[PDB]
Each structure stands twice: as structure tokens, then as C-alpha cells.
Amino acid sequence: QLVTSL
């Protein structure tokens, strides 16, 4: 998985 702050 990837995790991105938006």
C-alpha cells in the first residue's frame, strides 16, 4: 500500500 497526505 501507499499513504499520501492530501
Added chain:
Amino acid sequence: SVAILQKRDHEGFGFVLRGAKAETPIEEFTPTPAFPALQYLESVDVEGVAWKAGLRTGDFLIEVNGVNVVKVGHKQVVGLIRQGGNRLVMKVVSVT
């Protein structure tokens, strides 16, 4: 539910997106109420844009600006979110 988020140039939307990498959509993953999509909101910042619009930790991301992203890889979903700039229309499902 649908949330229409409008942020200013200088802020974020106030949520952390998490989910499967893929680069090319894959494939016959079948959503179910328990796992309705590949990407979800790991967290939402209180007093952020998403939180004020009622999005919550654990919400699964179904559509971005009208495009179904249930089976779409994380990079590509981020790209679609960035394409919209300061406006983001999100459809979500609460697995709660």
C-alpha cells in the same frame, strides 16, 4: 455520501489517503460492504476541509470528480485528486 470539498491554494484537504499500489487498474477485485474499495481515508484532520465537510477516518473512496476509483491504484487516484486543483468532489462509503 458525496462531499464537495473546496480548499484554498494554501491549504490541504486535510485527509490521508491509503491503499493498494497498482499503476495499472487491477482487476476483478470485487467490492463488498466490508471492503468496498482499494483506497480509504486513514485519517482526517479536525478543523480541516474534509472534516468540516463530514468525512471521517475509515471512509472508503468510491469516486473522484465523477470517476469511479474503486479498483484504481493509489498513484492514479492521487493523480485524479491533484487534477482537480482546489476543488474535489468525493463519493465515499462508511464501512462503519
